[PDB]
Coordinates of C-alpha atoms and ligand atoms in Angstrom, one line a residue:
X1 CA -116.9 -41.0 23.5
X2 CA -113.3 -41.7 23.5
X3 CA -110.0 -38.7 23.1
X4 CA -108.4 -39.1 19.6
X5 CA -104.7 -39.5 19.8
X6 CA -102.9 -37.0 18.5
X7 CA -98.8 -37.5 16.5
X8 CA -95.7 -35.5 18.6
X9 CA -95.8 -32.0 18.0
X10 CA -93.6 -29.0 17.7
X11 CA -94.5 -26.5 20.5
X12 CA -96.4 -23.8 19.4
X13 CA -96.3 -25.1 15.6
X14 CA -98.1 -28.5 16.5
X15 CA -98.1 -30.6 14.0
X16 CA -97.7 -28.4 11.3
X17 CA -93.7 -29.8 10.9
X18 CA -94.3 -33.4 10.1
X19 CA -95.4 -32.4 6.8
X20 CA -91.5 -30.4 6.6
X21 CA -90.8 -33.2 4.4
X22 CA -90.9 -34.2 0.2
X23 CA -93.3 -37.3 1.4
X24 CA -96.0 -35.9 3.4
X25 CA -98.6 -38.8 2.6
X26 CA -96.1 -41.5 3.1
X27 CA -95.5 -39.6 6.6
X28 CA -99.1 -39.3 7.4
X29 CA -99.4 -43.6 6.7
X30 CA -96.3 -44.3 9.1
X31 CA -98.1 -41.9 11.6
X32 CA -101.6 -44.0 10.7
X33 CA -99.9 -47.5 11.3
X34 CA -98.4 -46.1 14.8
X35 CA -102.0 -44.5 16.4
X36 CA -104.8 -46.3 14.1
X37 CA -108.1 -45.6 12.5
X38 CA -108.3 -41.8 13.3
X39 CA -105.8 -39.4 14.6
X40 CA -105.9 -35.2 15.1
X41 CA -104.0 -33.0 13.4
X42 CA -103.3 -29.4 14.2
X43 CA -101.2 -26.6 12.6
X44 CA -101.9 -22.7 13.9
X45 CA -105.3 -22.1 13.0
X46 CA -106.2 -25.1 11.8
X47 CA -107.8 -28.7 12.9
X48 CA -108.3 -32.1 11.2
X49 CA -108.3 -35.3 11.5
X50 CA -107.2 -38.4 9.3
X51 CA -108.9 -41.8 9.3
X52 CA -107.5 -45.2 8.2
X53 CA -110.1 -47.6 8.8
X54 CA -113.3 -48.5 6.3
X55 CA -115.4 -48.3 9.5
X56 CA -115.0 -44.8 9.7
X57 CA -114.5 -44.2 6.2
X58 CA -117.8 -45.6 5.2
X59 CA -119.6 -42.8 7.2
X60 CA -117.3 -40.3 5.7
X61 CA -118.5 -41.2 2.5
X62 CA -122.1 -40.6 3.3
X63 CA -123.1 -37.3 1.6
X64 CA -126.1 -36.9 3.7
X65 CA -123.6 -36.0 6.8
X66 CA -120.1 -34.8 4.8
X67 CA -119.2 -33.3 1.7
X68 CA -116.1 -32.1 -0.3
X69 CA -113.6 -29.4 1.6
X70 CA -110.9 -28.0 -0.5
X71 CA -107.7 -29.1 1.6
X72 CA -105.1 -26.4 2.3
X73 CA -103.6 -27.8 -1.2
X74 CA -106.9 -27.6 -3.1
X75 CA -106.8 -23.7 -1.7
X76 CA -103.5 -23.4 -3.3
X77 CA -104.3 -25.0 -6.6
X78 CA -107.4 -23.0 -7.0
X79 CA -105.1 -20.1 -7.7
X80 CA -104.9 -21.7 -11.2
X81 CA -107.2 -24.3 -11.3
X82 CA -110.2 -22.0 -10.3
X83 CA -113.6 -22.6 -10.2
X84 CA -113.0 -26.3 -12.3
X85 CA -114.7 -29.1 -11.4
X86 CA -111.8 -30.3 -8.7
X87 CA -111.2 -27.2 -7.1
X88 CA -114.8 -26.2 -6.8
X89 CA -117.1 -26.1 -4.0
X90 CA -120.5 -28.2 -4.3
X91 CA -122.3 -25.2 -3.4
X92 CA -120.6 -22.8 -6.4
X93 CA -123.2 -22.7 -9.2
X94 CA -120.2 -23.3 -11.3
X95 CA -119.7 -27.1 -9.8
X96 CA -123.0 -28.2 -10.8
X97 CA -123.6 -26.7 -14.0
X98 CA -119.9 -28.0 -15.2
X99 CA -120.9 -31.6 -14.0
X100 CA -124.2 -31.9 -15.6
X101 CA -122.4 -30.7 -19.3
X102 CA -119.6 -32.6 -18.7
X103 CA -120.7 -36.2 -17.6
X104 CA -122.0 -37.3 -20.9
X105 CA -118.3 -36.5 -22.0
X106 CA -116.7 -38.5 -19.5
X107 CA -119.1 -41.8 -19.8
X108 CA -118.2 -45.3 -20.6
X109 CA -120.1 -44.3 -23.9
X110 CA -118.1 -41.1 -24.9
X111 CA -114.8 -43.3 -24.6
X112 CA -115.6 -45.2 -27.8
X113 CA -115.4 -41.8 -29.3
X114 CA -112.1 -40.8 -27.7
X115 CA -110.1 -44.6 -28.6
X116 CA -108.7 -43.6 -31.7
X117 CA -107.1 -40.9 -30.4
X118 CA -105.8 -42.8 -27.6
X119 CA -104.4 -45.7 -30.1
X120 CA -102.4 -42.8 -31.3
X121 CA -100.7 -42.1 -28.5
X122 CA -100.5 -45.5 -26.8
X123 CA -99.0 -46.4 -30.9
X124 CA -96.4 -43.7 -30.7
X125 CA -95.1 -45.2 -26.9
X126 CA -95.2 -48.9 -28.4
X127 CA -93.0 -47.3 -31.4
X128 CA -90.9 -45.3 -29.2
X129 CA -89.8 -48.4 -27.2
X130 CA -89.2 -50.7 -30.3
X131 CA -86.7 -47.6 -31.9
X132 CA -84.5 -48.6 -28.6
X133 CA -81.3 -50.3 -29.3
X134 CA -80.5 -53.7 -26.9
X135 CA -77.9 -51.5 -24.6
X136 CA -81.1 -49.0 -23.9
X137 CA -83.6 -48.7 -20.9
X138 CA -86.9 -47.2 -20.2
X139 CA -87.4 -44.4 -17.9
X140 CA -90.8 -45.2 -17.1
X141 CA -92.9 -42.8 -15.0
X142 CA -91.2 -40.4 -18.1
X143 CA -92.4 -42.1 -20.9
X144 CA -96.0 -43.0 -19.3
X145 CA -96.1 -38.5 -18.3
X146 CA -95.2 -38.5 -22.0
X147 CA -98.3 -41.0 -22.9
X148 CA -101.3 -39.7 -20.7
X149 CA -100.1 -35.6 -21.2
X150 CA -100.6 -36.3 -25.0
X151 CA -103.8 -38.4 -24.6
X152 CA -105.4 -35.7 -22.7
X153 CA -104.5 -33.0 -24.7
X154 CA -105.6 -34.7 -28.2
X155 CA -109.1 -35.6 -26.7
X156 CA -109.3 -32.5 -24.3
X157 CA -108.9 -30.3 -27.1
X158 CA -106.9 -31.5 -30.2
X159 CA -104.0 -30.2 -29.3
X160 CA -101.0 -32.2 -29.4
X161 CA -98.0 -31.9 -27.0
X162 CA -95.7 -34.2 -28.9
X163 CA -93.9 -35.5 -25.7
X164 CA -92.4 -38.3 -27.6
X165 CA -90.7 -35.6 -29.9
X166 CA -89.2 -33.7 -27.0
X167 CA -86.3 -34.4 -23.8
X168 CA -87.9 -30.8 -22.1
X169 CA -91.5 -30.3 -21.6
X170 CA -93.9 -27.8 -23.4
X171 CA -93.8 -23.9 -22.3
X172 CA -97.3 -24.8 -20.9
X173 CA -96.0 -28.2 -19.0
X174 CA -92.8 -26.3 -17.1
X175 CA -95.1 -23.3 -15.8
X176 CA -98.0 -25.9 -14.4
X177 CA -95.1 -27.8 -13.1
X178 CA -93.4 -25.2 -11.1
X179 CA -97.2 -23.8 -10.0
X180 CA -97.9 -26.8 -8.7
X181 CA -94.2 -27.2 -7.3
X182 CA -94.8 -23.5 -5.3
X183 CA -98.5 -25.1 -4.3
X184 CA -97.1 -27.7 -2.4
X185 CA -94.1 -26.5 -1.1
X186 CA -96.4 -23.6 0.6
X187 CA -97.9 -26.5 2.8
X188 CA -95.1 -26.8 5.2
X189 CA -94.0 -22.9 5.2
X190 CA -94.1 -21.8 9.0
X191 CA -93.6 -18.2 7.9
X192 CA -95.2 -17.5 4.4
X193 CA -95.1 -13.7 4.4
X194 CA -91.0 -14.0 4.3
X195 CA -89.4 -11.7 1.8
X196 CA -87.3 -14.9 0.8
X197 CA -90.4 -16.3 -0.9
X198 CA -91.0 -13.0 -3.0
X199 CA -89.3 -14.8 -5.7
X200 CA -91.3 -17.5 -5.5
X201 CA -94.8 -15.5 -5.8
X202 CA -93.6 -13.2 -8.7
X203 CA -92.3 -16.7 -10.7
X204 CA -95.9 -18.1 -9.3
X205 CA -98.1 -15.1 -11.0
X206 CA -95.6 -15.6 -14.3
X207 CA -96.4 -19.1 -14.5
X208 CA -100.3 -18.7 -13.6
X209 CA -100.0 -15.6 -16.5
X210 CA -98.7 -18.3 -19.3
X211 CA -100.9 -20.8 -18.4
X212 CA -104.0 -18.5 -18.8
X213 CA -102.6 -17.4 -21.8
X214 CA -102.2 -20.8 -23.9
X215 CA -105.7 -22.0 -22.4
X216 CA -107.2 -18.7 -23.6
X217 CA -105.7 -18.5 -26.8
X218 CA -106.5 -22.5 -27.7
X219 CA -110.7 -21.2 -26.6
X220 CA -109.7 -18.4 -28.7
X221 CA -108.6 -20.1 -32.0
X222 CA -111.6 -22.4 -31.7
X223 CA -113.9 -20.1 -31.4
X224 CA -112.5 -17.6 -34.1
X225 CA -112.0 -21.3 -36.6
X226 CA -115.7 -22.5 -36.0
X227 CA -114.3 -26.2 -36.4
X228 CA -116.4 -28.8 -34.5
X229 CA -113.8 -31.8 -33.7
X230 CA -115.1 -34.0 -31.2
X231 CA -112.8 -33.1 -28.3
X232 CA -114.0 -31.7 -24.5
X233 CA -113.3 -28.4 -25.6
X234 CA -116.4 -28.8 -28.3
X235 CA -118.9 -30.4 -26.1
X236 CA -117.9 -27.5 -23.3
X237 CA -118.8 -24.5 -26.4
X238 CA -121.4 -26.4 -27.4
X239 CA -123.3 -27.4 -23.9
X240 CA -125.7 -26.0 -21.8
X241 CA -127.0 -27.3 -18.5
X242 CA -129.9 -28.4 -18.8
X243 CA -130.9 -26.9 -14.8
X244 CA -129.5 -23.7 -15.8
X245 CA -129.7 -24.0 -19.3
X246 CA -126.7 -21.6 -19.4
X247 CA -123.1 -22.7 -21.5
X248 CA -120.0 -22.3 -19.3
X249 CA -118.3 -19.1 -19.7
X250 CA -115.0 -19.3 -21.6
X251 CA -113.1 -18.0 -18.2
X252 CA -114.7 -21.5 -16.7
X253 CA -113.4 -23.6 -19.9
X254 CA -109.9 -22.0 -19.1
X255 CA -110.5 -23.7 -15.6
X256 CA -111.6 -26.8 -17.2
X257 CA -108.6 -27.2 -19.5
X258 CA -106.2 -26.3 -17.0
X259 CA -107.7 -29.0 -13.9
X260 CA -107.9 -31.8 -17.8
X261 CA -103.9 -31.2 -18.1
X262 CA -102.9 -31.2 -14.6
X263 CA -105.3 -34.5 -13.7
X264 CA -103.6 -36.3 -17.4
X265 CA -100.3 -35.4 -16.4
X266 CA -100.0 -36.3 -13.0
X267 CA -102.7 -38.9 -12.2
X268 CA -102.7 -41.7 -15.3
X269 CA -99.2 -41.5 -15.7
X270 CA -98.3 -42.5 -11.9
X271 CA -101.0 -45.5 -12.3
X272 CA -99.3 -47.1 -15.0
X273 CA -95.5 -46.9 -13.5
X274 CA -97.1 -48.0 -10.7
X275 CA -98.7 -51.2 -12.6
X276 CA -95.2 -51.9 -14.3
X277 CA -93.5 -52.2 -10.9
X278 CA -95.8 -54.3 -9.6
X279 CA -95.8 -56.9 -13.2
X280 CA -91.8 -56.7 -13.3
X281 CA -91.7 -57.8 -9.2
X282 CA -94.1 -60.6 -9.7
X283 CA -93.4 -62.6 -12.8
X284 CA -96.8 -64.6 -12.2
X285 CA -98.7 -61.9 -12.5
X286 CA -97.1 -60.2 -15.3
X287 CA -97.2 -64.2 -17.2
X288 CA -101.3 -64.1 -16.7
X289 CA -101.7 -60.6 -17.7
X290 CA -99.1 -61.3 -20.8
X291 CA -101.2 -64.2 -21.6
X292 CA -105.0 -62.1 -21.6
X293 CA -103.1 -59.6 -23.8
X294 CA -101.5 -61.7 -26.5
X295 CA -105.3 -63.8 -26.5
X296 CA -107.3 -60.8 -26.7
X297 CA -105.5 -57.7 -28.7
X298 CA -105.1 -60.0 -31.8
X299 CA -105.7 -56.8 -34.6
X300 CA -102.2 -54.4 -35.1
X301 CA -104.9 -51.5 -33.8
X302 CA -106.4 -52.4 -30.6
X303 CA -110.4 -51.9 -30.6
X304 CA -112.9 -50.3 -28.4
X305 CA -114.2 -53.9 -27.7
X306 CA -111.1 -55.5 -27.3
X307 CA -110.0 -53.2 -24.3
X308 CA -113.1 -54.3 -22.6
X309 CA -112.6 -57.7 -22.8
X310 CA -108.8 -57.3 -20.6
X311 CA -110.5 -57.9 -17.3
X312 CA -107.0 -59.3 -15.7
X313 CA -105.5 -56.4 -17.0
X314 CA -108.4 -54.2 -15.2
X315 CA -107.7 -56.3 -11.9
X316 CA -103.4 -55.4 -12.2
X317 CA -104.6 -52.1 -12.1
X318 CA -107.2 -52.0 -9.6
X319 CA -104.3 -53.6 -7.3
X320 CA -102.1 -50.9 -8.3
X321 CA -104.6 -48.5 -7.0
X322 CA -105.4 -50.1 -3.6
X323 CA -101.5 -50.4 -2.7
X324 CA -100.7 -46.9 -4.3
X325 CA -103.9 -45.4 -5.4
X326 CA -102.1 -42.6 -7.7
X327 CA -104.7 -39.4 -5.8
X328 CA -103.9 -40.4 -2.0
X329 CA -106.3 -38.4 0.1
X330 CA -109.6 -36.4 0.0
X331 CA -111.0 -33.7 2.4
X332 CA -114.6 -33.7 4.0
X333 CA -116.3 -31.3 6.1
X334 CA -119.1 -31.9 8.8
X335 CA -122.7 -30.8 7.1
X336 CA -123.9 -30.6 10.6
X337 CA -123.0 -31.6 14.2
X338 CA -122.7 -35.6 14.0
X339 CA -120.9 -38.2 16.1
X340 CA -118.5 -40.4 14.2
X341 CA -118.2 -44.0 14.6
X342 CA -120.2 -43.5 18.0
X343 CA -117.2 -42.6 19.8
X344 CA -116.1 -39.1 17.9
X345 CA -118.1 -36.2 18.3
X346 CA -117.6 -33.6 15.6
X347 CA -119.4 -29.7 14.8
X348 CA -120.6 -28.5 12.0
X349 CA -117.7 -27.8 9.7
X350 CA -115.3 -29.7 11.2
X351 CA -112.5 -31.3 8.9
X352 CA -111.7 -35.0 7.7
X353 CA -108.7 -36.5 5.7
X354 CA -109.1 -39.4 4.5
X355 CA -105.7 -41.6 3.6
X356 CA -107.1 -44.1 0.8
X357 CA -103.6 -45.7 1.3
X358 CA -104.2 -47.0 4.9
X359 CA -108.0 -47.7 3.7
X360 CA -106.7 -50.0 1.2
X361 CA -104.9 -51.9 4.0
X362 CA -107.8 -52.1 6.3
X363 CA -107.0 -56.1 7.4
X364 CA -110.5 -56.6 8.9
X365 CA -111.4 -55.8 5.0
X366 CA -108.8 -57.5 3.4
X367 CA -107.0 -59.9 5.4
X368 CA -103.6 -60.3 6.7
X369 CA -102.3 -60.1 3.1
X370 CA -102.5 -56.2 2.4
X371 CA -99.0 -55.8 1.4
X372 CA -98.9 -58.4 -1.0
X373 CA -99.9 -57.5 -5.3
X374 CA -102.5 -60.1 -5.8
X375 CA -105.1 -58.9 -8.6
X376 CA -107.1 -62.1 -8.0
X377 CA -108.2 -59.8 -4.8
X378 CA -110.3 -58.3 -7.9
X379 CA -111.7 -61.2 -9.5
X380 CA -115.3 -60.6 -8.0
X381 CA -116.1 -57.2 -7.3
X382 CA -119.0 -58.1 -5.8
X383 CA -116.8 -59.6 -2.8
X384 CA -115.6 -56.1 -2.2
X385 CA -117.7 -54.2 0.7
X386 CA -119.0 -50.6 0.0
X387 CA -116.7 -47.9 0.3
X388 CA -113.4 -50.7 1.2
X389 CA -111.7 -49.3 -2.0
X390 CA -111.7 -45.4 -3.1
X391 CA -109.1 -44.5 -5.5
X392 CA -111.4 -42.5 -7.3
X393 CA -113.1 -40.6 -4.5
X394 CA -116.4 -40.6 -3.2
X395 CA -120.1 -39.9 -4.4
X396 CA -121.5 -37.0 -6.6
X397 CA -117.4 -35.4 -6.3
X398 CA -115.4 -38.6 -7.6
X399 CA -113.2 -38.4 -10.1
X400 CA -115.2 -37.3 -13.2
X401 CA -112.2 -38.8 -15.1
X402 CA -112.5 -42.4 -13.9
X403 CA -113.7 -44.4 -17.4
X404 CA -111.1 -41.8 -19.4
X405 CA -107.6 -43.0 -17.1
X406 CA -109.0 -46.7 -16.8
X407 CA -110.0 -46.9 -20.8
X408 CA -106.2 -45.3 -21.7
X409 CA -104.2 -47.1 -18.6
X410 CA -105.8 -50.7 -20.0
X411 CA -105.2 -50.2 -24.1
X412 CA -102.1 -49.1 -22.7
X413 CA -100.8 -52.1 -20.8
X414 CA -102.3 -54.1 -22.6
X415 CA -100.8 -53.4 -25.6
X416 CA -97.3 -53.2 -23.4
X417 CA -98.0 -56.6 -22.5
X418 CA -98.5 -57.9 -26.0
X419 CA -95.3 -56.1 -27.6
X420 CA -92.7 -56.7 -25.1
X421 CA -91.2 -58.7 -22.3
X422 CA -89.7 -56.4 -19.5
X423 CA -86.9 -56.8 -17.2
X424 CA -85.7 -55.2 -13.9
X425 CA -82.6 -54.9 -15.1
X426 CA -81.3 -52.6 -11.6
X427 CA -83.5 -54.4 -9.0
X428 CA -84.7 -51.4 -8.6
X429 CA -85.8 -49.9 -5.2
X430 CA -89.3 -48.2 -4.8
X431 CA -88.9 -44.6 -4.4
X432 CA -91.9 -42.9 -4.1
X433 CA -92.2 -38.4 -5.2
X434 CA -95.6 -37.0 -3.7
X435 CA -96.5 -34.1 -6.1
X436 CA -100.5 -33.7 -5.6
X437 CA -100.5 -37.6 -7.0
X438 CA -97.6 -40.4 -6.3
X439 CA -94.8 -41.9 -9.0
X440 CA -92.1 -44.5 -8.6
X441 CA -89.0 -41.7 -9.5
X442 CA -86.3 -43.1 -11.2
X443 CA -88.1 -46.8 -11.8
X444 CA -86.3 -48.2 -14.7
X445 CA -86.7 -51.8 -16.8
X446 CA -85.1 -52.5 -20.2
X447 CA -88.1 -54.0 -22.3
X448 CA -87.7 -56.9 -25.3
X449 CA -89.7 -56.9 -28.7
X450 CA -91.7 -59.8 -29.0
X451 CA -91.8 -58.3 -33.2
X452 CA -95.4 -58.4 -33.4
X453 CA -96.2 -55.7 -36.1
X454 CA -98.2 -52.7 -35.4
Ligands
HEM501 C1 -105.7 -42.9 -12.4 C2 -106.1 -41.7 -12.6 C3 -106.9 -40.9 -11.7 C4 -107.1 -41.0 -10.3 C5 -106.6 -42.0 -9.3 C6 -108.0 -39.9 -10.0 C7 -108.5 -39.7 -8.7 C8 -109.4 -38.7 -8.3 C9 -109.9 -38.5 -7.0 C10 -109.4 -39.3 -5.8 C11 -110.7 -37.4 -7.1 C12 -111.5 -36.8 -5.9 C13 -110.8 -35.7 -5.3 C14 -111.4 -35.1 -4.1 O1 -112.4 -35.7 -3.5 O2 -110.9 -34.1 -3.6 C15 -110.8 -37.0 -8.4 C16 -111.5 -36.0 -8.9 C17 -111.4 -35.5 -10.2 N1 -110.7 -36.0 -11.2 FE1 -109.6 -37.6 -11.2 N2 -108.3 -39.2 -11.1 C18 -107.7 -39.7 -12.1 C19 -107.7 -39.3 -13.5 C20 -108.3 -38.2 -13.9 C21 -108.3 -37.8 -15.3 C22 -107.6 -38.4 -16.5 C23 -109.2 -36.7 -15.3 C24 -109.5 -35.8 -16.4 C25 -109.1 -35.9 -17.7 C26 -109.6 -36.5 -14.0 C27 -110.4 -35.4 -13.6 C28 -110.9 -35.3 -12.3 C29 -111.8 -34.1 -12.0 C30 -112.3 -33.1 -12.9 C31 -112.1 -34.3 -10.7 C32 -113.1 -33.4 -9.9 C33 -114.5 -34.0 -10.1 C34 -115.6 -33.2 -9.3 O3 -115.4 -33.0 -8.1 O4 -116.6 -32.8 -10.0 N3 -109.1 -37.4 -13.2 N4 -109.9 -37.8 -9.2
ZP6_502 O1 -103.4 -29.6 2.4 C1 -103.9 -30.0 3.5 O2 -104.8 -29.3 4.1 C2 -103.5 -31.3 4.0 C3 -102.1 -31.1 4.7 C4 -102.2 -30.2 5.9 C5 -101.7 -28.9 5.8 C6 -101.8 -28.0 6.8 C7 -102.4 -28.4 8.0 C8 -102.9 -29.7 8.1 C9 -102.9 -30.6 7.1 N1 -103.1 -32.2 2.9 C10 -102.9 -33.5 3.0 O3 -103.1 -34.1 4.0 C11 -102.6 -34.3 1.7 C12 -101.2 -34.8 1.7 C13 -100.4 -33.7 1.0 C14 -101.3 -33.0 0.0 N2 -102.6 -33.4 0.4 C15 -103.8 -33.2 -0.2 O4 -104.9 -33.5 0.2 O5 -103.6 -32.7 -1.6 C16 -104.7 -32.3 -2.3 C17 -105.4 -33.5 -3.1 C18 -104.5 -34.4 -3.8 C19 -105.1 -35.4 -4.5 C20 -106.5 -35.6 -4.5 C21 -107.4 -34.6 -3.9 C22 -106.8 -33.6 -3.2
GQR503 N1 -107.9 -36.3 -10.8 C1 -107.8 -35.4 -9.6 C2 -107.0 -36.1 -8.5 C3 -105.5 -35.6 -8.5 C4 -105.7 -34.4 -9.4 C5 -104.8 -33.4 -9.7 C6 -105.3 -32.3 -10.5 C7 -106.5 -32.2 -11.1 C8 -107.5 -33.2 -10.8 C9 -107.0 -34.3 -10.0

């Protein structure tokens, strides 16, 4: 049994003003790399703790001892997101009964049926970027928000955003924005009840009010046309559980919808900047994916079976993920008393972070290395131990979305790859914004046609 150390803290707030900051989780890694596997953290009236290492992490990860907590985040989200499936406990009737009728639409299977509507998108980005004139640059993490915010609202439910045909965001996009904006900023707030933050809840319950109305009017217009498109929003009117055998209620789809929006916007996006900045600042890599792309994606329209067959292009972004995996950290909670790792004795219903960042940099998993982009890391993922990489969560509550954002980020980048050569043109210096997911802000490179027609 050892004592956990624990980072500096602020008198009577604790720890609470480390996360006083617009980088929290890059905060939380510097703090990890200073005390090690597993540190406590307290703010008033609260206790958790955040571990680094795979050795702890792999019994974090067993379900039999831990499951999902909502974070104080989560909490905060849930004022929108509701009973969805990511802000959801495991034990709500609604979790279950959502996961069983929407699996089969988030398959390896189903995403032969969503493709062409991804082509669409990904086609209108490839287009967009051949329209520039030679002084012109890319704003990436813009353009790929632009990309997966359209994808997901074609396939989620037919709608589109046309991001490409805008500079400012959809009604919709500004309110979710600014929710989750208000969400996060609450985090650090010593003194929440302030009158100075009255603005901020009325603005919170406008922008909670819009969103609730386009979500319900879209359920609403499908309902009332009788039209059966093969979107999310069909197989969620159409579905029943089969333990139940109830549908969701439309109040649930709303949920649904809303948690679809927020995880295409903010998730996919920050995956695929990230990707580009590691290509442009290693040539060789970028060359061997370049090469896998040209070779494979030789139709104008890239097929179902072609995206398959870019495994390099898979292994740049499974890098990607281990260095930046786009959804940082997930919160457990103690089923029962336990004792973790031998050494750290928890109760019932204590609290775990875990820091995928500082997983993915575990040396005695990955050698001395960790810092260095090398997708070969990924050429047999057989090699890779249980529970070493989790950028997609853990168990029965990882990311539903997985096959969806690694089917659109590789048509995507691959077809990138095949169209253009890309520059650094600023040298530019990583600059990581935390939202609830990370993004290289202000990551710029000026991009040359190869003139291969769509
Ligand atoms: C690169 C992209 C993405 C990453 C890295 C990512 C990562 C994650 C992670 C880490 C979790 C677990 C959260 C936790 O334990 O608290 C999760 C859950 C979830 N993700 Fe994603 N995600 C991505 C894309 C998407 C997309 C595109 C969708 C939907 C269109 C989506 C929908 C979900 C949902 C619904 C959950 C909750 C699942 C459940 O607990 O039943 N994700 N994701
Ligand atoms: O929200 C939390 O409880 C903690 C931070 C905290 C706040 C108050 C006292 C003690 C700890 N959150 C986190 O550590 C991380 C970093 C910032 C946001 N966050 C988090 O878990 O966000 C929710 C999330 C994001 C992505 C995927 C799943 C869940
Ligand atoms: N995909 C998960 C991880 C980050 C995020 C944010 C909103 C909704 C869902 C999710």
């Amino acid at each position: 049994i050892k004592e956990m150390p624990q980072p500096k803290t602020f008198g009577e707030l604790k720890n609470l003003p480390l996360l006083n900051t617009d980088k929290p989780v890059q905060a939380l890694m510097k703090i990890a790399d200073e005390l090690g596997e597993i540190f406590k953290f307290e703010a008033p009236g609260r206790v958790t703790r955040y571990l680094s290492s795979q050795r702890l992490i792999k019994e974090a990860c067993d379900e039999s001892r831990f499951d999902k907590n909502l974070s104080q985040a989560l909490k905060f989200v849930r004022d929108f997101a509701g009973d969805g499936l990511f802000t959801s406990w495991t034990h709500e009737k609604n979790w279950k009964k959502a996961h069983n009728i929407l699996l089969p639409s988030f398959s390896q299977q189903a995403m032969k049926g969503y493709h062409a509507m991804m082509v669409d998108i990904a086609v209108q980005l490839v287009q967009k970027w051949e329209r520039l004139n030679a002084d012109e640059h890319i704003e990436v993490p813009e353009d790929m928000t632009r990309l997966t915010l359209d994808t997901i609202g074609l396939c989620g439910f037919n709608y589109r955003f046309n991001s490409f045909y805008r500079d400012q965001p959809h009604p919709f996009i500004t309110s979710m924005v600014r929710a989750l904006d208000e969400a996060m900023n609450k985090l650090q707030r010593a003194n929440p009840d302030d009158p100075a933050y009255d603005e901020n809840k009325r603005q919170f319950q406008e922008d909670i009010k819009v969103m609730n109305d386009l979500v319900d009017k879209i359920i609403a217009d499908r309902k009332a046309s009788g039209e059966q498109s093969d979107d999310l929003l069909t197989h969620m009117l159409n579905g029943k559980d089969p333990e139940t055998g109830e549908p969701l209620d439309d109040e649930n789809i709303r949920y649904q919808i809303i948690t679809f929006l927020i995880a295409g916007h903010e998730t996919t996006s920050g995956l695929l900047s990230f990707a580009l900045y590691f290509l442009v600042k290693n040539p060789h890599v970028l060359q061997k994916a370049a090469e896998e792309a040209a070779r494979v994606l030789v139709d104008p329209v890239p097929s179902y079976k072609q995206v398959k067959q870019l495994k390099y292009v898979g292994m740049v972004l499974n890098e990607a993920l281990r260095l930046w995996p786009t959804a940082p950290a997930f919160s457990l909670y103690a089923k029962e008393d336990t004792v973790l790792g031998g050494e750290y004795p928890l109760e019932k219903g204590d609290e775990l972070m875990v820091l995928i960042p500082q997983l993915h940099r575990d040396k005695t998993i990955w050698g001395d290395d960790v810092e260095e982009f090398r997708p070969e890391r990924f050429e047999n993922p057989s090699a890779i131990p249980q529970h070493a990489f989790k950028p997609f969560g853990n168990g029965q509550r990882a990311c539903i979305g997985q096959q969806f954002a690694l089917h659109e980020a590789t048509l995507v980048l691959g077809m990138m790859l095949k169209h253009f050569d890309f520059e650094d043109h600023t040298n530019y210096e990583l600059d990581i914004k935390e939202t609830l997911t990370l993004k290289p802000e202000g990551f710029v490179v000026k991009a040359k046609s190869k003139k291969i027609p769509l």
